[PDB]
Amino acid sequence: QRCGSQGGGSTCPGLRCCSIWGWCGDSEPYCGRTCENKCWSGERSDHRCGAAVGNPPCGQDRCCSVHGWCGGGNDYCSGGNCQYRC
Q: What is the largest CA-CA distance in the chain?
A: 35
Q: What is the resolution of this structure in A?
A: 1.7
H-run or E-run covering 7:
none
d(CA 62, CA 31) in angstroms, rounded, equals 12
SS3 86: coil
List the Cα angle 33/38/44 in 5-degree steps.
100
CA distances from 14 to 62, 80 (A): 14, 15
Q: Which long-range contacts (CB under 8 A, 24 or more apart) does 56-62 make?
A: 57/15, 57/17, 57/31, 57/85, 58/85, 60/31, 60/32
Q: What does 8-71 look like in DSSP terms, one character per residue?
A: TSPPPGGG-EEETTSBEESSHHHHSTTEEES-GGG--TT-B-SGGGT-----TT-EEETTSBEE
The torsion region of residue 14 among left (phi > 0), alpha (psi -120 to 50) and beta comes to: left
